[PDB]
Amino acid sequence: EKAGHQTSAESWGTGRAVARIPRVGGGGTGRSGQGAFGNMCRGGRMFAPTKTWRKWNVKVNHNEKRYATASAIAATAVASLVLARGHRVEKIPEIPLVVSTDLESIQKTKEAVAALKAVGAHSDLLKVLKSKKLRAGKGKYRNRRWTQRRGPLVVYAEDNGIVKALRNVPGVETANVASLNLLQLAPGAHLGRFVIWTEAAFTKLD
Amino acid sequence: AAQKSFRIKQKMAKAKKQNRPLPQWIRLRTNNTIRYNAKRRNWRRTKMNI
Amino acid sequence: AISKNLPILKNHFRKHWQERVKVHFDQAGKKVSRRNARATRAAKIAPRPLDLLRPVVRAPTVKYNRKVRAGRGFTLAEVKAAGLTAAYARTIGIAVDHRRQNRNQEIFDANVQRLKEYQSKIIVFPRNGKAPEAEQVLSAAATFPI
Amino acid sequence: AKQSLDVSSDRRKARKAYFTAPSSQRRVLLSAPLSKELRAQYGIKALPIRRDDEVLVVRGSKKGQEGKISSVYRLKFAVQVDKVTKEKVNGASVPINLHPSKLVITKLHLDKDRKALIQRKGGKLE
RNA sequence: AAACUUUCAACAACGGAUCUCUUGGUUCUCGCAUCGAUGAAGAACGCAGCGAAAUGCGAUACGUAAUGUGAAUUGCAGAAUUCCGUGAAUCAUCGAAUCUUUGAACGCACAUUGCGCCCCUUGGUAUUCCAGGGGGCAUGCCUGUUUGAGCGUCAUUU
RNA sequence: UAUCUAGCGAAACCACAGCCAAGGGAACGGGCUUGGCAGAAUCAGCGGGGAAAGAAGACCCUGUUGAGCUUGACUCUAGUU
RNA sequence: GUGGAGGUCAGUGACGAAGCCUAGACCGUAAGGUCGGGUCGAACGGCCUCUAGUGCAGAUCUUGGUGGUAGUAGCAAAUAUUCAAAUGAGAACUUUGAAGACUGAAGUGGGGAAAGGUUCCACGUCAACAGCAGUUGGACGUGGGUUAGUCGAUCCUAAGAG
RNA sequence: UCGAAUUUGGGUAUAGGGGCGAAAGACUAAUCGAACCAUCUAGUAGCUGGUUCCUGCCGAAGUUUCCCUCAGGAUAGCAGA
RNA sequence: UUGACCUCAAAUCAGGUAGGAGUACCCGCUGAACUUAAGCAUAUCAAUAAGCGGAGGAAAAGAAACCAACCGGGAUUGCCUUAGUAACGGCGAGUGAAGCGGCAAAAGCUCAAAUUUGAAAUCUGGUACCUUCGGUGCCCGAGUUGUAAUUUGGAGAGGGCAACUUUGGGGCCGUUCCUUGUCUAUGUUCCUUGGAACAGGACGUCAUAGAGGGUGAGAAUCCCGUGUGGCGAGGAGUGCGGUUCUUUGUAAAGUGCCUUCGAAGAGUCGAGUUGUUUGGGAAUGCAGCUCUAAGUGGGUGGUAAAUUCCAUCUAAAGCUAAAUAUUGGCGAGAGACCGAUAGCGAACAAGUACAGUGAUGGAAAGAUGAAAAGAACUUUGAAAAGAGAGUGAAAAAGUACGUGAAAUUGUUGAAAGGGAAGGGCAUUUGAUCAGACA
């Protein structure tokens, strides 16, 4: 907020054949005389400088919110939306994809991946990995360096090692039915996330 | 001036000692970055103001 | 600056207000910090239960006297009538209010019975040593709802 | 996936830490992997390079060459193998700068301490 | 028709846009509570084998003691006794020291490397003069110690 | 001195520019319309023109813009009684 | 059409990304889009969304850079120079010798106060500087140089400070 | 004008609604009908200047009324959606 | 004459404390004007800036001389709300609180006024010893013009009667808290492009580790780290968990009944006036001057006064954690933030260089390459340099150094030009090029 304004610069008034921005006073440095404060001057304050009391968060009605996430769950069936969303699902048994509750208790990553593959997730786990790109923007040097696709969403009822087994495999996200988050059910506001429901989780939905 | 205080003659002594070119060996150091002496002074160009 | 059929507004922004804007960016911060603060008090406080026993009280004025509401402390009368002293009731997690006076019998029996049930549903460890670990119920308010 | 609240994935915080790292920290940064043989020989995967070790360049143009580490040039984040050098126009010879991660360690220079280190990591030795 | 002027292009100038960089900035959040007469913050002058500066330090001067590491430092020279070791290092850590001239800044002054006083000590034939070494002397205020003042005032002498 | 040479080498100013007559036009055109005309590249002079350059007109008016100064203009005030 | 953000095309790329050049090609009424070639060297784009420090010819606009002017105005106050030798790659300008002049002791002579602060002196030396020059310099480089019982300060008091 | 109300060095005092003035509103560091420095301050501006891509459709007003109003507002009207 | 007392002095007397800094936040003092009112003086800006004094990790506030008017509540602080409301206001412009309710945090108390009077029971200092944040003995001294125990309004005290119930002070080890150290997976296998493989292909491995950085180009698996755990070290400290030694006691406290009492802050409360301030209105706080109380009293009860009632606290002395604040400081994690004319003025020997008598003012300035491999040598040159050579993946990277736009400039090539140039529609000529035939 104090930026651009660390000068005691005055206008020179008119009558001096030169434009009338404030100008740095004094001499001997060549800053002395330069246009000041102005939003069009090198070094000036910017126009309408940004402020922290900008609205950052947003209120959504709790009920509209549920409608949204309800709808996002509804479309995790509907084979077409899931395909249309990325999500290589042509070679999976059926939709929804309900898996044995024994999944929640898997402790080890390699055993986790191996079952995800067994039930059909192979192609999607490969979409990620074959997709990691250097983020194009300046974000690439703002802690947003790489980029990739979004894997399957494994929904559990009780976490018994499954959340830790999967955590480190690219693209796979785990979630607990009782929670469930619109941002993962519909990444970037497209419907149709590939969801692998443990059976325990599937029944708790109701 | 021509009959000074020790404080002043002292300041001039430290002055003299800063009026020397770069010790050229520095130019060779790893990551060295100083090219020339950028604080070089001259009696007939910039007065030291005591 | 008067025009159109608009409601006359009163937007008090003629002092140097931009100097005194408080954005609660630390809202999530201070909740995390408040939760940890209680999780430490819980553990410091042995099996004792974070809060004290509060009395029933009838809320003041013609607008809130329908409701009943936790008051500050238990009055010297209720404490005695419920069979203990002020000085001691404090060390037993009971809040005592030297300022509150008893004018209504109903409330009085209410709080004296509230003190009976409190005493009957706690256990007070000996001064000695033992310290027969007995796990904290965390409120007391929750235990003895109003 | 970072999980502690005292690691920083901040790319700026990292690069500053590396380039401004003190000598004592660069010693461990300048670690070379032991050779296949030496690894089963010591039950140990790699070690902070040190001067009179014996090394084989398993990367770069000087792939295949080998020799004794002449100096660890911690300042330059670079190690110099006396045996791997440039000749110039004026015949003069000049060290090439090599990086421990592209070397492999073949014969260690053993101290009282160098051994106790190998044992501190959980190794066996000859 | 040249020259010249103009326009387009290639190659070469001038200039530093653009693209890509980033040990910097900016904003948010979390944790914490520690300057000083036991001389702070700031200033001045100094200090390296070869430095003007930046950084660091104080005549023990890019550092001394200690502790951890376990072999560098490196622009050049260098020492070499320091490499199975009370031990390399422009290392880390830091609990011990040194810490010029100053500064609230305190013997007095201070546009002065100006001028006193005391104590111990050393030399000069010296309690007294000169010179070297060490240790000292500001203000307000509190508690106490000692030495005092006043027909303010109590008793006690013969 | 200028002026020709060797070396050294600025500034103001610059919409684009630079031949006229009349006409009309913001009522005095370098450009527009109709005529006169019109031939490379230039040197020394010159003060007709460029309504030349130099300063967001000191004059004059407007502004619910000032300030120095004055006074039985409004409103106060140190002091003094 | 731009900067950044969610999703996606398992998009483009060191066998050459981005950029820049190009009276070469094509699409759109247009803002613009696409391609070829050349230069280049590490990143980058399409589509659905999100987002703003989002588009310049002007503001006697800000900062930087560049012209016409123009090899032009100009380099004319202080009476003045000349011949030879030496040096040197190079001499109207340096050094020496010779001549002609000047200041004319109210000095262009001989010292100081204030102020500068090393300019003093020697050796080396010409990239910049000395509005021609340069072998010369108050320039550059590297060194040397300021000796007190009696000269000053220090002591005293002045207006005054405190 | 040039032997004194002369010239002049150093030291010293006077400070901004204040100083100093053989009196010119002069002088007070190229600043004087109120010095310089920073801050309040991005002071206010009914006034001047500028206000950055394309295409498509519609498309005005200088009139009414009240205004310390007359270079401005409100109001109606015309305009779009 | 001698010894005290009171009050006042002096010491380089014995031991200590104050200054100054900083100041983001906190307690006070002091105090504008620009501005807004379309003019302007009340008002507004603003109880703001500038000035002055004083603190802390927070400060302050705080256990009701409170809110209320209820079926009453019950220290303070802060949020949500009350509310842009009650109210103030050239009633204009503008301004503007509080009680209740929900919530965060919670916590409570101590002096003064009392005869210990069968024993000043209290305390600083010196001194010797000790088990040294301290204890003991002794001696000066303080103190009756009152130091302790007791009591604090919620009470409480002196009597009298009647019974039970309860404990203090150390060691030492842990845990807790603080500072720290070390260790803990998996490819560097082949082929291709390359100067470099960290790139594409092939075949694998680890994964509670595919966060991040380094390394000759996009590296989970080359290095450091990451994840998960393990092994240590040095502190502090009475939180509490263990232990263990002293029994502090003819000590201290709690409660029932009967009786007598029941001390409670003054140039203050309050009142007049003046000024200031406040939403506070016949006056919200504050201050100056004058007047100045009382004890069934005093204060408050948001319209002045007289009378009668009622409600409600207990002033003029005091301490106190948390919830609260924080453009400063120490240490951390971050971002739909800026990307070297931007972002702090400063990404660099930046508050530098430079200006100013001074207060102050205050820049510009990042990038060869993976690596200096920073060009040996030859030749022309007085030198600088040029020309060869050489290095490099590249000199179309030569310490003028990545890319290297534009204005503007040189050269070469093409073309036009009788007082500007440039533009529109159209076609000749010259140059140049797409597509389509099949």
Ligand SMILES: [Mg+2]
């Ligand atoms: Mg501002």
Ligand SMILES: [Mg+2]
């Ligand atoms: Mg200013």
Ligand SMILES: [Mg+2]
């Ligand atoms: Mg101009």
Ligand SMILES: [Mg+2]
């Ligand atoms: Mg500027």
Ligand SMILES: [Mg+2]
């Ligand atoms: Mg800026």
Ligand SMILES: [Mg+2]
């Ligand atoms: Mg603006």
Ligand SMILES: [Mg+2]
């Ligand atoms: Mg909604």
Ligand SMILES: [Mg+2]
């Ligand atoms: Mg596994």
Ligand SMILES: [Mg+2]
């Ligand atoms: Mg991979």
Ligand SMILES: [Mg+2]
């Ligand atoms: Mg992408």
Ligand SMILES: [Mg+2]
């Ligand atoms: Mg980005």
Ligand SMILES: [Mg+2]
């Ligand atoms: Mg980018």
Ligand SMILES: [Mg+2]
């Ligand atoms: Mg980009």
Ligand SMILES: [Mg+2]
């Ligand atoms: Mg002198």
Ligand SMILES: [Mg+2]
């Ligand atoms: Mg200066």
Ligand SMILES: [Mg+2]
């Ligand atoms: Mg001076």
